[PDB]
Amino acid sequence: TYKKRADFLSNDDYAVYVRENIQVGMMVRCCRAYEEVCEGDVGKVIKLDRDGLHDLNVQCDWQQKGGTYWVRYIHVELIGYPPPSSSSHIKIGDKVRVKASVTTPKYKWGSVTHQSVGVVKAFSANGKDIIVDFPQQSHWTGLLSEMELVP
């Protein structure tokens, strides 16, 4: 489902591919060892920054290391999103809205309203929130219990 380093000519070509396809909550494998992260370690992405292509942009929780570590795009191979288990049946890609019963959403409205419909982009690392792209505001953070699938 995801390409690997061998599918590209240069390191920077691959890093651009990883950057366009990575999201918080994804599982990844270390495909090139870096400091404390050994090749083949498996990590869950917990934070993404967007500085230069060669900067430390990807923070993961690594299984073999037993803790968190920042790596570059070139160091990771994308595996995929875990299955839905929030019991909300909300999944990546679904259309969602803020519940009518919510007066002010946990992280504030921003440019969103009760009539906005957005697309789920990621499950936040804390297991309680989602990142949603709405037409009126990209990277909008919602508390899952305040959101619902659009009928």
* Nearest distance, CB of residue 1 and another protein, angstroms: 29
* Nearest distance, CB of residue 30 and another protein, angstroms: 14
Output the six-digit token pair for 23. Answer: 């999201």
Residue numbers of the site for another protein (CB under 8 A)?
35-36, 56, 59, 69-70, 105-110, 112, 126, 137, 140-141
Q: Kindly tell me which of 88 and 137 has the beta carbon lying closer to another protein.
A: 137
* Nearest distance, CB of residue 140 and another protein, angstroms: 5
Q: Kindly tell me which of 2 and 48 has the beta carbon lying closer to another protein.
A: 48
Whole-angstrom distance, CA of residue 124 vs CA of residue 27: 13
Whole-angstrom distance, CA of residue 149 vs CA of residue 106: 18
